[PDB]
Amino acid sequence: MQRLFIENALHAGAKHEATREQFNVLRLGEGSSLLVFNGRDGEWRAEIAMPSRQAVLVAVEQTRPQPAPCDLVYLFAPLKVGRLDYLVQKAVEMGAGVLQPVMTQHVQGKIGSLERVRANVIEAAEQCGVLGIPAVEEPRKLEDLLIDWPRDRRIVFCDEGSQNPLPILEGIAERRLALLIGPEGGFSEAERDLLRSRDFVTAIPLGPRILRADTAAVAAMAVIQATLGDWR
Amino acid sequence: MQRLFIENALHAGAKHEATREQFNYLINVLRLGEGSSLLVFNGRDGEWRAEIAMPSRQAVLVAVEQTRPQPAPCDLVYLFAPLVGRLDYLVQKAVEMGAGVLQPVMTQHVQGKIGSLERVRANVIEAAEQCGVLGIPAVEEPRKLEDLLIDWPRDRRIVFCNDSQNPLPILEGIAERRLALLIGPEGGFSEAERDLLRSRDFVTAIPLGPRILRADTAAVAAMAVIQATLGDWR
Numbered sequence: 001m002q003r004l005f006i007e008n009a010l011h012a013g014a015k016h017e018a019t020r021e022q023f024n025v026l027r028l029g030e031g032s033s034l035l036v037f038n039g040r041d042g043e044w045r046a047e048i049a050m051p052s053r054q055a056v057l058v059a060v061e062q063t064r065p066q067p068a069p070c071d072l073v074y075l076f077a078p079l080k081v082g083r084l085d086y087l088v089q090k091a092v093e094m095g096a097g098v099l100q101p102v103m104t105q106h107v108q109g110k111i112g113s114l115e116r117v118r119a120n121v122i123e124a125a126e127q128c129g130v131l132g133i134p135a136v137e138e139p140r141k142l143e144d145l146l147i148d149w150p151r152d153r154r155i156v157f158c159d160e161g162s163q164n165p166l167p168i169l170e171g172i173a174e175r176r177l178a179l180l181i182g183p184e185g186g187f188s189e190a191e192r193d194l195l196r197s198r199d200f201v202t203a204i205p206l207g208p209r210i211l212r213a214d215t216a217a218v219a220a221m222a223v224i225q226a227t228l229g230d231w232r
Numbered sequence: 233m234q235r236l237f238i239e240n241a242l243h244a245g246a247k248h249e250a251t252r253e254q255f256n257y258l259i260n261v262l263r264l265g266e267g268s269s270l271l272v273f274n275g276r277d278g279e280w281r282a283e284i285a286m287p288s289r290q291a292v293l294v295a296v297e298q299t300r301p302q303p304a305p306c307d308l309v310y311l312f313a314p315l316v317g318r319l320d321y322l323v324q325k326a327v328e329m330g331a332g333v334l335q336p337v338m339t340q341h342v343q344g345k346i347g348s349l350e351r352v353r354a355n356v357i358e359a360a361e362q363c364g365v366l367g368i369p370a371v372e373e374p375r376k377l378e379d380l381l382i383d384w385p386r387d388r389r390i391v392f393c394n395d396s397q398n399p400l401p402i403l404e405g406i407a408e409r410r411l412a413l414l415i416g417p418e419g420g421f422s423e424a425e426r427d428l429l430r431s432r433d434f435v436t437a438i439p440l441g442p443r444i445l446r447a448d449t450a451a452v453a454a455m456a457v458i459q460a461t462l463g464d465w466r
Binding site for chain 2: 086089090093094095127128129130163164165166205206207208209210211212215218219220221222223225226227230231232
Protein backbone atom coordinates (compact mmCIF):
# COMPACT_ATOMS: atom_id res chain seq x y z
CA MET A 1 0.00 0.00 0.00
CA GLN A 2 1.11 3.61 -0.57
CA ARG A 3 2.03 5.55 2.57
CA LEU A 4 1.35 9.24 3.22
CA PHE A 5 2.66 11.41 6.06
CA ILE A 6 0.01 13.92 7.24
CA GLU A 7 -0.13 16.73 9.84
CA ASN A 8 -3.55 15.75 11.12
CA ALA A 9 -4.43 14.03 14.38
CA LEU A 10 -5.15 10.40 13.65
CA HIS A 11 -8.07 8.47 15.07
CA ALA A 12 -11.09 6.58 13.68
CA GLY A 13 -12.87 9.03 11.38
CA ALA A 14 -10.01 11.54 11.15
CA LYS A 15 -10.19 13.37 7.86
CA HIS A 16 -7.48 14.73 5.67
CA GLU A 17 -7.99 16.77 2.53
CA ALA A 18 -5.52 16.01 -0.27
CA THR A 19 -3.53 19.26 -0.13
CA ARG A 20 -2.76 19.80 -3.84
CA GLU A 21 -1.25 16.33 -3.32
CA GLN A 22 -4.36 15.11 -5.21
CA PHE A 23 -1.62 12.79 -6.41
CA ASN A 24 -3.69 11.71 -10.73
CA VAL A 25 -1.17 8.88 -10.08
CA LEU A 26 -0.77 6.45 -8.24
CA ARG A 27 -4.23 6.24 -9.91
CA LEU A 28 -6.27 5.36 -6.79
CA GLY A 29 -10.04 5.83 -6.76
CA GLU A 30 -12.98 6.06 -4.38
CA GLY A 31 -12.81 3.24 -1.81
CA SER A 32 -9.05 2.79 -2.27
CA SER A 33 -6.95 2.12 0.78
CA LEU A 34 -3.65 3.66 1.77
CA LEU A 35 -1.59 3.89 4.94
CA VAL A 36 -1.34 7.21 6.74
CA PHE A 37 0.79 8.25 9.68
CA ASN A 38 1.64 11.48 11.49
CA GLY A 39 4.64 10.82 13.76
CA ARG A 40 2.57 10.57 16.96
CA ASP A 41 -0.58 8.42 16.58
CA GLY A 42 1.09 5.53 14.71
CA GLU A 43 -0.03 4.08 11.38
CA TRP A 44 -3.61 3.78 10.10
CA ARG A 45 -5.25 2.39 7.00
CA ALA A 46 -7.39 5.15 5.47
CA GLU A 47 -9.90 5.07 2.63
CA ILE A 48 -10.50 7.75 -0.01
CA ALA A 49 -13.95 9.38 -0.25
CA MET A 50 -14.02 12.00 -3.10
CA PRO A 51 -16.66 14.77 -2.59
CA SER A 52 -16.06 16.61 -5.87
CA ARG A 53 -14.53 14.36 -8.56
CA GLN A 54 -10.97 16.78 -4.52
CA ALA A 55 -9.90 13.70 -2.53
CA VAL A 56 -10.53 13.16 1.20
CA LEU A 57 -8.62 10.53 3.26
CA VAL A 58 -10.71 8.90 6.04
CA ALA A 59 -8.70 6.89 8.60
CA VAL A 60 -10.48 3.63 9.50
CA GLU A 61 -8.22 1.35 11.57
CA GLN A 62 -4.83 1.54 13.30
CA THR A 63 -2.37 -0.86 11.71
CA ARG A 64 0.77 -0.14 13.85
CA PRO A 65 1.21 1.73 17.11
CA GLN A 66 3.69 4.62 17.60
CA PRO A 67 7.16 3.38 18.59
CA ALA A 68 9.36 5.19 21.09
CA PRO A 69 11.56 7.64 19.20
CA CYS A 70 14.88 6.27 17.86
CA ASP A 71 17.54 7.40 20.24
CA LEU A 72 20.65 7.34 17.94
CA VAL A 73 22.15 10.78 17.14
CA TYR A 74 23.81 11.28 13.72
CA LEU A 75 26.44 14.05 13.79
CA PHE A 76 27.44 14.76 10.21
CA ALA A 77 29.36 17.23 8.10
CA PRO A 78 27.75 18.27 4.86
CA LEU A 79 29.77 17.27 1.84
CA LYS A 80 30.82 19.12 -1.22
CA VAL A 81 31.26 15.64 -2.80
CA GLY A 82 28.42 13.21 -1.92
CA ARG A 83 24.68 14.09 -2.35
CA LEU A 84 22.77 15.64 0.64
CA ASP A 85 19.39 14.05 -0.22
CA TYR A 86 21.01 10.55 -0.08
CA LEU A 87 22.82 11.27 3.25
CA VAL A 88 19.66 12.41 4.93
CA GLN A 89 17.33 9.71 3.59
CA LYS A 90 19.86 7.00 4.54
CA ALA A 91 20.13 8.33 8.12
CA VAL A 92 16.37 7.95 8.48
CA GLU A 93 16.41 4.42 6.95
CA MET A 94 19.34 3.41 9.22
CA GLY A 95 17.50 4.49 12.37
CA ALA A 96 18.86 7.92 13.33
CA GLY A 97 16.47 9.84 15.68
CA VAL A 98 18.34 13.15 15.39
CA LEU A 99 20.22 14.61 12.38
CA GLN A 100 22.69 17.15 13.66
CA PRO A 101 24.87 18.88 11.03
CA VAL A 102 28.35 19.58 12.32
CA MET A 103 30.70 22.34 11.05
CA THR A 104 34.37 21.31 11.23
CA GLN A 105 37.71 22.75 10.10
CA HIS A 106 37.65 21.12 6.62
CA VAL A 107 33.93 21.43 5.71
CA GLN A 108 33.40 22.69 2.17
CA GLY A 109 29.77 21.68 1.52
CA LYS A 110 26.74 23.51 2.86
CA ILE A 111 23.56 22.35 4.53
CA GLY A 112 21.21 24.61 2.56
CA SER A 113 17.55 24.94 3.56
CA LEU A 114 16.49 22.94 6.60
CA GLU A 115 13.06 22.97 5.03
CA ARG A 116 14.38 20.83 2.17
CA VAL A 117 16.20 18.57 4.57
CA ARG A 118 12.96 18.03 6.59
CA ALA A 119 11.06 17.26 3.35
CA ASN A 120 13.74 14.67 2.45
CA VAL A 121 13.26 13.26 5.98
CA ILE A 122 9.46 12.92 5.41
CA GLU A 123 9.93 11.28 2.01
CA ALA A 124 12.43 8.73 3.52
CA ALA A 125 9.96 8.00 6.41
CA GLU A 126 7.06 7.48 4.00
CA GLN A 127 9.09 5.19 1.72
CA CYS A 128 10.70 3.08 4.41
CA GLY A 129 7.94 2.73 7.04
CA VAL A 130 9.64 4.65 9.79
CA LEU A 131 6.93 6.05 12.09
CA GLY A 132 9.14 8.28 14.21
CA ILE A 133 10.15 11.41 12.33
CA PRO A 134 13.80 12.11 13.20
CA ALA A 135 14.49 15.70 14.35
CA VAL A 136 16.65 17.94 12.17
CA GLU A 137 18.81 20.45 13.99
CA GLU A 138 20.42 23.73 12.98
CA PRO A 139 24.10 23.18 12.21
CA ARG A 140 26.56 23.63 15.11
CA LYS A 141 30.33 23.90 15.38
CA LEU A 142 31.97 20.65 16.49
CA GLU A 143 33.95 22.25 19.31
CA ASP A 144 30.79 23.94 20.70
CA LEU A 145 28.98 20.57 20.69
CA LEU A 146 31.89 18.76 22.46
CA ILE A 147 32.12 21.29 25.32
CA ASP A 148 28.55 20.85 26.68
CA TRP A 149 28.10 17.23 25.59
CA PRO A 150 25.92 14.96 27.79
CA ARG A 151 28.29 12.38 29.24
CA ASP A 152 25.61 9.67 29.25
CA ARG A 153 25.93 9.55 25.41
CA ARG A 154 28.95 7.95 23.77
CA ILE A 155 30.21 9.47 20.47
CA VAL A 156 31.59 6.96 17.98
CA PHE A 157 33.86 8.32 15.26
CA CYS A 158 35.81 6.64 12.49
CA ASP A 159 39.59 6.34 12.63
CA GLU A 160 42.18 3.89 11.22
CA GLY A 161 42.96 0.77 13.26
CA SER A 162 43.05 -4.41 13.63
CA GLN A 163 40.33 -2.84 11.47
CA ASN A 164 37.29 -4.66 12.96
CA PRO A 165 34.79 -2.27 14.67
CA LEU A 166 32.84 -5.08 16.40
CA PRO A 167 35.05 -5.83 19.46
CA ILE A 168 35.35 -2.06 20.05
CA LEU A 169 31.59 -1.55 19.82
CA GLU A 170 31.20 -4.48 22.22
CA GLY A 171 33.13 -2.54 24.91
CA ILE A 172 30.78 0.49 24.92
CA ALA A 173 28.74 0.63 28.14
CA GLU A 174 26.59 3.72 27.46
CA ARG A 175 22.98 3.06 26.57
CA ARG A 176 22.91 6.17 24.35
CA LEU A 177 24.96 6.69 21.21
CA ALA A 178 25.97 9.19 18.57
CA LEU A 179 27.88 8.56 15.31
CA LEU A 180 30.14 11.33 14.09
CA ILE A 181 31.27 11.37 10.45
CA GLY A 182 33.32 14.32 9.20
CA PRO A 183 33.71 15.92 5.75
CA GLU A 184 35.56 14.56 2.61
CA GLY A 185 38.81 15.96 4.04
CA GLY A 186 38.34 14.30 7.44
CA PHE A 187 39.23 15.99 10.71
CA SER A 188 42.20 18.31 11.15
CA GLU A 189 45.02 17.14 13.40
CA ALA A 190 43.78 19.42 16.21
CA GLU A 191 40.20 18.09 15.77
CA ARG A 192 41.57 14.57 15.99
CA ASP A 193 43.53 15.42 19.15
CA LEU A 194 40.46 16.98 20.70
CA LEU A 195 38.18 14.00 19.89
CA ARG A 196 40.74 11.59 21.34
CA SER A 197 41.06 13.81 24.44
CA ARG A 198 37.36 13.21 25.30
CA ASP A 199 36.34 10.52 27.79
CA PHE A 200 33.03 10.10 26.01
CA VAL A 201 34.45 9.63 22.47
CA THR A 202 35.40 6.22 21.03
CA ALA A 203 37.20 5.69 17.71
CA ILE A 204 36.26 2.78 15.45
CA PRO A 205 37.92 1.43 12.34
CA LEU A 206 35.91 0.53 9.24
CA GLY A 207 38.03 -1.99 7.45
CA PRO A 208 41.15 -1.88 5.30
CA ARG A 209 40.01 0.44 2.50
CA ILE A 210 39.29 4.14 2.85
CA LEU A 211 35.59 4.87 2.82
CA ARG A 212 34.02 8.09 1.77
CA ALA A 213 31.78 9.91 4.34
CA ASP A 214 28.42 8.80 2.85
CA THR A 215 29.56 5.17 2.69
CA ALA A 216 30.99 5.28 6.20
CA ALA A 217 27.75 6.64 7.65
CA VAL A 218 25.63 3.69 6.40
CA ALA A 219 28.41 1.14 7.17
CA ALA A 220 29.03 2.44 10.73
CA MET A 221 25.26 2.66 11.43
CA ALA A 222 24.86 -0.97 10.31
CA VAL A 223 27.55 -2.34 12.69
CA ILE A 224 26.39 -0.05 15.50
CA GLN A 225 22.70 -1.04 15.08
CA ALA A 226 23.59 -4.72 14.81
CA THR A 227 25.92 -4.68 17.86
CA LEU A 228 24.33 -2.19 20.26
CA GLY A 229 21.19 -0.83 18.61
CA ASP A 230 17.73 -1.69 17.32
CA TRP A 231 18.73 -4.47 14.95
CA ARG A 232 19.12 -6.69 18.09
CA MET B 233 48.34 13.12 -3.34
CA GLN B 234 45.99 12.66 -6.29
CA ARG B 235 45.54 9.14 -7.75
CA LEU B 236 45.10 8.28 -11.45
CA PHE B 237 44.16 5.01 -13.18
CA ILE B 238 46.37 4.39 -16.22
CA GLU B 239 46.24 1.70 -18.97
CA ASN B 240 49.97 1.67 -19.62
CA ALA B 241 52.25 -0.88 -17.95
CA LEU B 242 53.98 0.39 -14.83
CA HIS B 243 57.65 0.17 -13.93
CA ALA B 244 60.43 2.70 -13.29
CA GLY B 245 60.41 5.06 -16.26
CA ALA B 246 56.94 4.12 -17.52
CA LYS B 247 55.33 7.07 -19.25
CA HIS B 248 51.72 8.16 -19.63
CA GLU B 249 50.81 11.12 -21.81
CA ALA B 250 47.97 12.91 -20.03
CA THR B 251 44.93 13.08 -22.36
CA ARG B 252 43.19 16.44 -23.05
CA GLU B 253 40.85 15.75 -20.09
CA GLN B 254 43.70 14.64 -17.76
CA PHE B 255 46.01 17.57 -18.60
CA ASN B 256 43.28 20.13 -17.89
CA TYR B 257 42.35 18.16 -14.79
CA LEU B 258 45.82 17.77 -13.28
CA ILE B 259 47.23 21.08 -14.55
CA ASN B 260 44.34 23.55 -14.96
CA VAL B 261 42.05 22.10 -12.23
CA LEU B 262 44.59 21.00 -9.56
CA ARG B 263 47.33 23.24 -11.01
CA LEU B 264 50.11 20.65 -10.51
CA GLY B 265 53.30 21.53 -12.36
CA GLU B 266 56.68 20.23 -13.39
CA GLY B 267 58.15 18.02 -10.69
CA SER B 268 54.80 17.46 -8.97
CA SER B 269 54.26 13.99 -7.61
CA LEU B 270 51.01 11.96 -7.85
CA LEU B 271 49.98 8.35 -7.43
CA VAL B 272 49.41 6.16 -10.46
CA PHE B 273 48.02 2.55 -10.84
CA ASN B 274 46.77 0.20 -13.56
CA GLY B 275 45.13 -2.79 -11.84
CA ARG B 276 48.02 -5.10 -12.39
CA ASP B 277 51.40 -3.59 -11.45
CA GLY B 278 50.41 -2.10 -8.04
CA GLU B 279 50.64 1.63 -7.18
CA TRP B 280 53.54 3.96 -8.20
CA ARG B 281 54.50 7.58 -7.36
CA ALA B 282 54.96 9.43 -10.65
CA GLU B 283 56.29 12.90 -11.40
CA ILE B 284 54.97 15.29 -14.05
CA ALA B 285 57.24 16.21 -16.96
CA MET B 286 56.16 18.79 -19.54
CA PRO B 287 57.36 19.09 -23.12
CA SER B 288 54.80 21.84 -23.94
CA ARG B 289 53.09 24.77 -22.18
CA GLN B 290 50.94 18.55 -23.16
CA ALA B 291 52.01 16.77 -19.93
CA VAL B 292 53.69 13.36 -19.47
CA LEU B 293 53.58 11.32 -16.24
CA VAL B 294 56.75 9.40 -15.45
CA ALA B 295 56.49 6.63 -12.84
CA VAL B 296 59.39 6.76 -10.40
CA GLU B 297 58.91 4.29 -7.53
CA GLN B 298 56.34 1.70 -6.41
CA THR B 299 54.42 2.71 -3.16
CA ARG B 300 52.14 -0.34 -2.86
CA PRO B 301 52.30 -3.82 -4.41
CA GLN B 302 49.31 -5.22 -6.42
CA PRO B 303 47.11 -7.04 -3.87
CA ALA B 304 45.15 -10.29 -4.28
CA PRO B 305 41.75 -9.72 -5.98
CA CYS B 306 38.93 -9.39 -3.45
CA ASP B 307 36.81 -12.55 -3.41
CA LEU B 308 33.36 -11.10 -2.54
CA VAL B 309 30.78 -11.39 -5.33
CA TYR B 310 28.09 -8.75 -5.58
CA LEU B 311 24.89 -9.87 -7.29
CA PHE B 312 22.69 -6.85 -7.91
CA ALA B 313 19.49 -5.84 -9.65
CA PRO B 314 19.48 -2.63 -11.74
CA LEU B 315 17.83 0.56 -10.52
CA VAL B 316 20.77 4.61 -13.33
CA GLY B 317 21.02 7.34 -10.65
CA ARG B 318 21.14 4.75 -7.95
CA LEU B 319 23.32 2.57 -10.26
CA ASP B 320 26.45 4.78 -10.41
CA TYR B 321 26.26 5.03 -6.66
CA LEU B 322 25.69 1.28 -6.29
CA VAL B 323 28.67 0.46 -8.41
CA GLN B 324 30.92 2.95 -6.64
CA LYS B 325 29.92 1.85 -3.12
CA ALA B 326 30.45 -1.78 -4.04
CA VAL B 327 34.06 -0.97 -4.86
CA GLU B 328 34.60 0.79 -1.51
CA MET B 329 33.03 -1.99 0.48
CA GLY B 330 35.28 -4.56 -1.26
CA ALA B 331 33.35 -6.37 -3.97
CA GLY B 332 35.66 -8.24 -6.40
CA VAL B 333 32.95 -8.97 -8.98
CA LEU B 334 29.91 -6.89 -9.93
CA GLN B 335 27.30 -9.23 -11.43
CA PRO B 336 24.15 -7.52 -12.72
CA VAL B 337 21.10 -9.77 -12.28
CA MET B 338 17.75 -9.72 -14.09
CA THR B 339 14.76 -10.55 -11.88
CA GLN B 340 10.99 -10.42 -12.30
CA HIS B 341 10.46 -6.93 -10.85
CA VAL B 342 13.52 -5.18 -12.40
CA GLN B 343 12.31 -1.83 -13.82
CA GLY B 344 15.52 0.09 -14.56
CA LYS B 345 18.14 -1.14 -17.04
CA ILE B 346 21.93 -1.55 -16.98
CA GLY B 347 22.67 0.76 -19.91
CA SER B 348 26.16 -0.02 -21.20
CA LEU B 349 28.98 -1.78 -19.35
CA GLU B 350 31.18 1.13 -20.57
CA ARG B 351 29.72 3.51 -18.03
CA VAL B 352 29.55 0.87 -15.26
CA ARG B 353 33.30 0.30 -15.74
CA ALA B 354 34.13 4.02 -15.70
CA ASN B 355 32.38 4.25 -12.29
CA VAL B 356 34.41 1.35 -10.95
CA ILE B 357 37.58 3.21 -11.97
CA GLU B 358 36.43 6.51 -10.42
CA ALA B 359 35.73 4.79 -7.08
CA ALA B 360 39.02 2.87 -7.18
CA GLU B 361 40.89 6.12 -7.83
CA GLN B 362 39.04 7.95 -5.06
CA CYS B 363 39.43 5.35 -2.30
CA GLY B 364 42.79 3.78 -3.20
CA VAL B 365 41.45 0.36 -4.15
CA LEU B 366 44.17 -1.37 -6.23
CA GLY B 367 42.26 -4.40 -7.57
CA ILE B 368 39.76 -3.44 -10.28
CA PRO B 369 36.60 -5.55 -9.73
CA ALA B 370 35.31 -7.25 -12.90
CA VAL B 371 31.93 -6.29 -14.34
CA GLU B 372 29.95 -9.21 -15.80
CA GLU B 373 27.29 -9.37 -18.47
CA PRO B 374 23.79 -9.26 -16.97
CA ARG B 375 22.22 -12.68 -16.33
CA LYS B 376 18.83 -13.80 -15.16
CA LEU B 377 18.69 -14.99 -11.53
CA GLU B 378 17.27 -18.40 -12.43
CA ASP B 379 20.13 -19.04 -14.90
CA LEU B 380 22.93 -18.03 -12.49
CA LEU B 381 21.62 -20.44 -9.86
CA ILE B 382 21.78 -23.55 -12.15
CA ASP B 383 25.54 -23.98 -12.15
CA TRP B 384 26.38 -21.71 -9.24
CA PRO B 385 29.50 -22.98 -7.46
CA ARG B 386 28.34 -25.01 -4.43
CA ASP B 387 31.36 -23.56 -2.68
CA ARG B 388 30.18 -19.90 -2.57
CA ARG B 389 27.37 -19.11 -0.10
CA ILE B 390 24.84 -16.58 -1.36
CA VAL B 391 23.64 -14.21 1.33
CA PHE B 392 20.38 -12.47 0.57
CA CYS B 393 18.19 -9.92 2.30
CA ASN B 394 12.56 -12.74 7.90
CA ASP B 395 11.76 -13.55 11.57
CA SER B 396 14.57 -12.01 13.66
CA GLN B 397 16.18 -8.64 13.12
CA ASN B 398 19.89 -9.27 13.83
CA PRO B 399 22.05 -10.57 10.99
CA LEU B 400 25.13 -11.23 13.24
CA PRO B 401 24.19 -14.67 14.79
CA ILE B 402 23.12 -15.92 11.36
CA LEU B 403 26.26 -14.60 9.67
CA GLU B 404 28.58 -16.20 12.29
CA GLY B 405 27.11 -19.59 11.41
CA ILE B 406 28.21 -19.49 7.78
CA ALA B 407 30.89 -22.17 7.38
CA GLU B 408 32.02 -21.12 3.91
CA ARG B 409 34.57 -18.33 3.61
CA ARG B 410 33.82 -17.74 -0.10
CA LEU B 411 30.81 -15.41 -0.35
CA ALA B 412 28.27 -13.62 -2.52
CA LEU B 413 25.77 -10.93 -1.58
CA LEU B 414 22.48 -10.75 -3.40
CA ILE B 415 20.27 -7.64 -3.34
CA GLY B 416 17.04 -7.41 -5.40
CA PRO B 417 15.37 -4.49 -7.16
CA GLU B 418 13.15 -1.83 -5.52
CA GLY B 419 10.16 -4.13 -6.12
CA GLY B 420 11.80 -7.03 -4.23
CA PHE B 421 11.67 -10.70 -5.23
CA SER B 422 8.53 -12.45 -6.57
CA GLU B 423 7.09 -15.29 -4.51
CA ALA B 424 8.54 -17.77 -7.08
CA GLU B 425 11.99 -16.21 -6.76
CA ARG B 426 11.76 -16.39 -2.91
CA ASP B 427 10.92 -20.06 -3.14
CA LEU B 428 13.81 -20.63 -5.54
CA LEU B 429 16.21 -18.97 -3.06
CA ARG B 430 14.94 -20.72 0.08
CA SER B 431 15.18 -24.11 -1.68
CA ARG B 432 18.94 -23.84 -2.35
CA ASP B 433 21.12 -25.10 0.52
CA PHE B 434 23.97 -22.74 -0.45
CA VAL B 435 21.62 -19.78 0.15
CA THR B 436 21.09 -18.08 3.52
CA ALA B 437 18.62 -15.31 4.31
CA ILE B 438 19.68 -12.48 6.65
CA PRO B 439 17.59 -9.67 8.10
CA LEU B 440 18.87 -6.12 8.20
CA GLY B 441 16.83 -4.52 10.95
CA PRO B 442 13.27 -3.41 11.49
CA ARG B 443 13.02 -0.75 8.72
CA ILE B 444 12.62 -1.36 4.98
CA LEU B 445 15.90 -0.40 3.32
CA ARG B 446 16.44 0.81 -0.21
CA ALA B 447 18.53 -1.60 -2.31
CA ASP B 448 21.56 0.70 -2.34
CA THR B 449 21.32 1.28 1.40
CA ALA B 450 20.90 -2.46 1.93
CA ALA B 451 23.95 -3.21 -0.19
CA VAL B 452 26.26 -1.08 1.91
CA ALA B 453 24.73 -2.03 5.25
CA ALA B 454 24.90 -5.75 4.28
CA MET B 455 28.50 -5.56 3.07
CA ALA B 456 29.49 -3.79 6.34
CA VAL B 457 28.24 -6.64 8.56
CA ILE B 458 29.50 -9.37 6.14
CA GLN B 459 32.99 -7.81 5.97
CA ALA B 460 33.11 -7.45 9.79
CA THR B 461 31.94 -10.96 10.70
CA LEU B 462 33.23 -13.08 7.77
CA GLY B 463 35.37 -10.95 5.50
CA ASP B 464 38.32 -8.58 5.29
CA TRP B 465 37.42 -6.18 8.14
CA ARG B 466 38.04 -8.86 10.86
